[PDB]
Design a protein around this ligand. Structure first.
Ligand SMILES: CCCCCCCCCCCCCCCCCC(=O)OC[C@H](COP(=O)(O)OCCN)OC(=O)CCCCCCCCCCCCCCCCC
Ligand code: SF4
Ligand code: SF4
Ligand code: SF4
Ligand code: SF4
Ligand SMILES: [Zn+2]
Lengths: 207, 61, 55, 45, 178, 109, 360, 145, 112
């Protein structure tokens, strides 16, 4: 057809939409939204209270045996009222398909811990707490996992500066690796490379 | 030896308008199905995966 | 640099406009055409600085 | 000037051996023990 | 398509010959002897090492190494302050400060590459529209002092002068692919 | 929609428990880490760190602070954090930068 | 000397790649991916390329697809050599490491000949590949492949049936199938214990759906089974390389959309529009349409994935990297229950963990 | 725009007139849009610039050798879309991605003209109009710029 | 009788038909206590009745597995147990209720 345009299929789109209605009506209490992307990836957005019910159902229900958790990502959009967006990616081997379950959280609004459901989350949620700062209830052992032992901050927050508030060096006076306020040599050079023109007119929001 | 490399499909002087092959501009927004803003049969995410067929090249190693 | 672009010839081209590459062909600089209608000076190629005259 | 680009040879490359070739050695067993027993008896005597 | 890698199949086959073979295997250390034989076989094979200082290994024309700034045959720095090299360098190692010349020409007055920040990626040499910045064949430029790894326009141009021949050859032999 | 403690009155109990724990731990740290500080210095620094967050009034933020402090105490009990990290609280290499305008006008801005 | 608890402390090699990427265009972020799993480079950058192509709604050209699969198999061989040989070196056996690193060096020579770098090539780029294979590289790959089988067979004659190796691995790190799935394992951490899963088969990408290759599966679920699985995977990689070499097609190597991939230098030097495209691509970069995706590949270790969120700018909005080994090193404790320090040292190897990817 | 070039001929070339110390005139890279002429005739009322000839060889410039100086002369650089008219001082002293862009006010003129004073790592590189409808209205003085 | 199941830790079941009938009947019993309108009740009853009918229909274990579409009959049994437990939990989670609280203004909006 077209050499430089990805091949387009509709069977998977249809099956994923049908399963979207499936889940949407099997869990009315929690599901707030459902969508299927042009990439054909099912995306169910649910109330945070419903993470445990939704994922337990998605793991156990015979028609949906989502027995693997690919990842527990978090995104940070600072304008919306709840900055943090938790994204549980799921895999089902029996039906050879993936799903995405999303919810929202704030600096002071924990999300239940799915460690009971998938033990694979034990470290993913620790990472989310370490970086974005979303607290998780009933996590068996919640700690920092990727940051410094005495670290103060939440690096993946958008507002957090890239280079942090502290740098380390060896001070031959005290004979220790001390911590000092950061002082770069050539500060990070941002670039203004956003063109004045709008590229993709499907997303032009009207007033 | 000095190579001479082939050209791509869109090395055409006619019928080569970019609007007829712009893959980027075909990305529509996601298709909502159920939204708070706005007897049936059981359905699976997709047809169940068949069973893998044991190979014949060297069946048992 | 300056002395080495100072020490060279001023090339002749019989046409009104002359194309410039770096001189390597496809190993030089993007082709640019310099117009040699001014007669009080010589056309200087922006990329490589070579100078052209009309005769 | 035709195109001269990296290509497999006409007719394709030769077949490749990509499978285990660990052989099975011929050594018996009764022989293995008989050699030892013969040596032991000789040394004993 | 799957193949079992270690599934035990038929078990009832017990024989006197099989049993004496198994006992010989256990007692005589047959498989261990076989491994020892393999090691000896290697002992009697030509070594794969190379006397490095007087015998450097092969490198292709695409090899990315110490940077250099090229010149035109007339002797002029190709650097026209594109600035694309600085814009594309993922690690932000290039620093350019350019000013108009006394000849009404565009040139660079501060061209610095921090070779302790460069990732040797080739994005500069491929985003240079006049083939000024290149990554020459050299791969031995270790220095004792850090400050000697912060390069400048001069050091780059002297590297270009030194390696112009090999840079020229590699570009000549590769430009068709690029 | 409280984190753990419903009210500030409930939260201060947890805060005081955390302080009890840190006070009881300081001797053990100073001894088993071979820090060159007096146990009094350690306890005073614990007090100072607690006081640094005294202004907070929101029950949920008090709870979050308690959680972070309890994690830090765990990190020190388990001796995961080393001396190089524990001493970082003391700011022993810092030279207090002046505060009055007459002098800051003189060092930069 | 019995291990009663394992508490893997990581983060000692975390350098905030996920946040750094958010500040760099889509082309300027590719080199990071070559460093996330420094053992298997081209597979990581293949994951990135497939994700960005998915968002761009463009398709790589056929020759680029075949080249990417070929070099992905070479990278899989590199990863399996590293895993097996370092595992053996830590367990005790040392000669196979030296034996096989010569072939690793030869594969590095191929890497360099094609990309100009012995690792961290950055060869695979969203759109296809940076440059076409230099003439003769297929011939050299054939010469290497036709012989690699004998070298792997020598390593096997060393390790496969040795009683010491069998005693040192067998019935160690035994993980049940359900427990593995729940723990989130992937790749051989799954196929070793009988689970019939392999993304290259189940959800093909590139041209993995045109080459026949078997997927080894283990029955016991222990270290010895997984070592056998890795060796068989190397053999199947040789199979796939043979097929790719025989079916390498002619044509372009990068998507012929000059608004995504750079135009050829001659075109840049003699075309106005091509020069504009070069300028903007290497300054601003492409503008990826808004969206989100989670691309997954069967990286030589497991299931390397990228969750990429784009807001229509030329820089990604969020790039979570799902590293295969994260869940594995999480499940270390479960695997190590009731084992000695030596058994644990063995167990860590089977995971085949690179902390570049673990830390991201 | 398209992705490729089907133009397989040579390109037009033009002479670079002298217009003064302020506005360098690399005229070959002119799209001949007459924004410069319209500004000269309307905003500044100087009536210097104009279009000569007909067809491709049409040239936008003073067909004598006048120097188009005005209190508003410098704005031609801003209005011209493609880099035909450029600033003699700011030649090749920076690139738009590099530079920082901070808004301020002009004090050189008593008018009150608003300004953007773009700087690139400690050095102010250029001064450019900042649109204020009432005061400036996208135009500043040559002195200020 | 199957000597082994490929999966590690999942052991062979001697009485697969009996175990399956038992589990499916238990699921169908626990479902009765859901509200008759529950989408979960409707769908799970359809599913369970289908599989129960297949088990009753086919004696041979190989053909039963092929009909069921679940790899090993032991895996299918395990899944039946999981479904039963899921029903037990659903009875208390009452997912059939209306939405708990609608999302904020543009919580699920993108690109922002
Ligand atoms: C006539 C009337 C009287 C007749 C009398 C007849 C007597 C017959 C006696 C035959 C027995 C010979 C003695 C053999 C001793 C070996 C003991 C043995 O059976 O092997 C044990 C062990 C194998 O391991 P494993 O599989 O665990 O065995 C137990 C299985 N449940 O084996 C091992 O320990 C191997 C692990 C250690 C490997 C060490 C590396 C050695 C490398 C090879 C050395 C070869 C040269 C040795 C000779 C040196 C001479 C100076
Ligand atoms: S290195 Fe190349 S692109 Fe960069 S300023 Fe010099 S000539 Fe221009
Ligand atoms: S090779 Fe890459 S990192 Fe190094 S200077 Fe060039 S663009 Fe920058
Ligand atoms: S404004 Fe610029 S592009 Fe337009 S006609 Fe004048 S010089 Fe040419
Ligand atoms: S940047 Fe614009 S005005 Fe300048 S040469 Fe390119 S196309 Fe012409
Ligand atoms: Zn020139």
């Amino acid at each position: 057809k077209r050499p430089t345009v990805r091949p387009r299929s509709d069977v998977t789109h249809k099956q994923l939409s049908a399963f979207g209605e499936y889940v949407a009506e099997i869990l009315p209490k929690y599901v707030q939204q459902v969508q299927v992307s042009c990439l054909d990836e099912l995306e169910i957005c649910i109330h945070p209270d419903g993470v445990i019910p939704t994922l337990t159902f998605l793991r156990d229900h015979t028609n949906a045996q989502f027995k693997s958790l690919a990842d527990l990502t978090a995104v940070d959009v600072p304008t919306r009222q709840n900055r943090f967006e938790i994204v549980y990616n799921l895999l089902s081997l029996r039906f050879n398909s993936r799903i995405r379950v999303k919810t929202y959280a704030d600096e002071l609004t924990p999300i239940d811990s799915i460690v009971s459901v998938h033990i694979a989350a034990n470290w993913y949620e620790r990472e989310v707490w370490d970086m974005f700062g979303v607290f998780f209830f009933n996590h068996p052992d919640l700690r920092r996992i990727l940051t410094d032992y005495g670290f103060e901050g939440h690096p993946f927050r958008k507002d957090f500066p890239l280079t942090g508030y502290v740098e380390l060096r060896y001070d031959d006076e005290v004979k220790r690796v001390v911590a000092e306020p950061v002082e770069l040599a050539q500060e990070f050079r941002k670039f203004d490379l956003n063109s004045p023109w709008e590229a993709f007119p499907a997303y032009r929001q009207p007033p | 030896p000095p190579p001479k490399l082939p050209v791509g499909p869109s090395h055409k002087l006619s019928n080569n308008y970019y609007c007829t092959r712009d893959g980027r501009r075909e990305v529509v927004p996601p298709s909502i199905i159920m939204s708070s803003q706005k007897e049936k049969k059981a359905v699976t995410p997709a047809p169940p995966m068949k069973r893998w067929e044991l190979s014949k090249d060297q069946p048992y190693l | 640099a300056i002395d080495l672009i100072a020490q060279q010839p001023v090339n002749e081209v019989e046409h009104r406009i002359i194309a410039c590459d770096g001189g390597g062909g496809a190993l030089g600089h993007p082709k640019v055409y310099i117009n040699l209608d001014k007669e009080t000076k010589t056309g200087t190629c922006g990329y490589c600085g070579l100078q052209f005259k009309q005769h | 000037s035709k195109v001269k680009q990296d290509m497999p040879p006409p007719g394709g490359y030769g077949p490749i051996d990509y499978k285990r070739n660990l052989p099975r050695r011929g050594l018996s067993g009764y022989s293995m023990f008989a050699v030892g027993i013969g040596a032991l008896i000789f040394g004993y005597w | 398509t799957y193949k079992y890698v270690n599934k035990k199949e038929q078990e009832s086959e017990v024989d006197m010959k099989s049993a004496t073979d198994n006992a010989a295997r256990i007692l005589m250390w047959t498989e261990l002897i076989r491994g020892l034989g393999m090691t000896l076989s290697y002992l009697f094979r030509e070594p794969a090492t190379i006397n490095y200082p007087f015998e450097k290994g092969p490198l292709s024309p695409r090899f990315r190494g110490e940077h250099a700034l090229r010149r035109y045959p007339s002797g002029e720095e190709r650097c026209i302050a594109c600035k694309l090299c600085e814009a594309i360098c993922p690690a932000q190692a290039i620093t350019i400060e350019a000013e108009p010349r006394a000849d009404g020409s565009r040139r660079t007055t501060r061209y610095d590459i921090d070779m302790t920040k460069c990732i040797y990626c080739g994005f500069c040499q491929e985003a240079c529209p006049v083939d000024a910045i290149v990554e020459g064949p050299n791969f031995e430029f270790s220095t004792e002092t850090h400050e000697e790894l912060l390069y400048n326009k001069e050091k780059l141009l002297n590297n270009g002068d030194k390696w112009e021949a090999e840079i020229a050859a590699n570009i000549q032999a590769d430009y068709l692919y690029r | 929609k409280p984190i753990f403690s419903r009210d500030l009155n409930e939260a201060k109990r947890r805060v005081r428990e955390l302080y009890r724990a840190w006070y009881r731990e300081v001797p053990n740290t100073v001894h088993l880490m071979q820090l060159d500080i007096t146990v009094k210095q350690g306890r005073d620094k614990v007090r100072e760190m607690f006081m640094k967050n005294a202004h907070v009034t929101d029950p949920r933020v008090v709870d979050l602070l308690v959680i972070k402090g309890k994690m830090e105490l765990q990190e020190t009990i388990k001796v995961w954090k080393q001396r190089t990290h524990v001493m970082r609280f003391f700011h022993e290499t810092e030279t207090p930068r002046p505060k009055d305008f007459l002098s800051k006008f003189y060092m930069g801005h | 000397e019995m291990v009663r608890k394992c508490d893997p402390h990581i983060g000692l090699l975390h350098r905030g790649t996920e946040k750094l990427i958010e500040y760099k265009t889509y082309l300027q972020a590719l080199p990071y991916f070559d460093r996330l799993d420094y053992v298997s480079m081209m597979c990581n950058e293949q994951a990135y390329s497939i994700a960005v192509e998915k968002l761009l709604n463009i398709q790589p050209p056929p020759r680029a697809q075949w080249i990417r699969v070929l070099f992905g198999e070479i990278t899989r061989i590199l990863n399996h050599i590293m895993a097996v040989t370092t595992h053996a070196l830590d367990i005790g056996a040392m000669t196979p490491f030296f034996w096989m690193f010569e072939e690793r060096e030869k594969m590095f020579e191929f890497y360099e000949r094609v990309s100009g770098a012995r690792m961290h090539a950055a060869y695979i780029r969203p759109g296809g590949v940076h440059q076409d294979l230099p003439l003769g590289l297929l011939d050299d790959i054939y010469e290497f492949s036709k012989n690699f089988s004998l070298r792997i067979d020598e390593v096997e004659e060393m390790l496969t049936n040795n009683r010491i190796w069998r005693n040192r691995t067998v019935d160690i790190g035994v993980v049940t199938a359900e427990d593995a799935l729940n723990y989130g394992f992937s790749g051989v951490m799954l196929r070793g214990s009988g689970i019939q899963w392999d993304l290259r088969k189940t959800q093909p990408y590139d041209v993995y759906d045109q080459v026949e290759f078997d997927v080894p599966i283990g029955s016991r679920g222990d270290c010895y089974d997984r070592y056998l699985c890795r060796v068989e995977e190397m053999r199947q990689s040789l199979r796939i390389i043979e097929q790719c070499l025989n079916k390498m097609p002619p044509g372009e190597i990068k998507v012929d959309d000059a608004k995504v991939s750079p135009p050829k230098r001659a075109e840049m030097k003699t075309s106005m529009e091509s020069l504009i495209h070069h300028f903007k691509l290497y300054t601003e970069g492409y503008q990826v349409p808004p969206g989100a995706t989670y691309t997954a590949i069967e990286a030589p270790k497991g299931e390397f994935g990228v969750y990429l969120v784009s807001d229509g700018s030329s820089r990604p909005y969020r790039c979570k990297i799902k590293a295969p080994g994260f869940a594995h090193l999480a499940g270390l404790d479960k695997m190590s229950k009731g084992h000695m320090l030596a058994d644990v040292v063995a167990i860590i190897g089977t995971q085949d963990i690179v902390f570049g990817e673990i830390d991201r | 725009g398209s992705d490729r070039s089907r133009f397989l001929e040579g390109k037009r070339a033009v002479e670079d007139k002298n217009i003064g110390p302020l506005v360098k005139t690399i005229m070959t890279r002119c799209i001949q849009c007459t924004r410069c002429i319209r500004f000269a005739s309307e905003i500044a009322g100087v009536d210097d610039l104009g279009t000569t000839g007909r067809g491709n060889d049409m040239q936008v410039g003073t067909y004598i050798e006048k120097m188009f100086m005005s209190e508003l002369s410098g704005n031609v650089i801003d209005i011209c879309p493609v880099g035909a008219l450029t600033s003699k001082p700011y030649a090749f002293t920076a690139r738009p991605w590099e530079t920082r862009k901070t808004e301020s006010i002009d004090v050189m003129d008593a008018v009150g003209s608003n300004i953007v004073v773009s700087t690139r790592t400690g050095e102010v590189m250029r001064i450019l109009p900042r649109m204020h409808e009432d005061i400036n209205e996208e135009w500043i003085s040559d002195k200020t710029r | 009788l199957k000597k082994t199941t490929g999966l590690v830790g999942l052991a062979v079941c001697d009485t697969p038909h009996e175990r399956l009938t038992i589990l499916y009947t238990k699921t169908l019993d626990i479902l009765k206590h859901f509200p008759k309108h529950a989408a979960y009740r409707k769908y799970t009853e359809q599913i369970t009745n289908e599989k129960l009918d297949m088990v009753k229909a086919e004696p041979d274990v190989k053909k039963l597995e092929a009909l069921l579409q679940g790899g090993e009959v032991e895996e299918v049994i395990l899944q039946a147990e999981k479904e039963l437990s899921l029903a037990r939990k659903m009875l208390k989670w009452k997912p059939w209720e209306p939405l708990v609280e609608e999302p904020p203004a543009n919580q699920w909006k993108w690109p922002i």
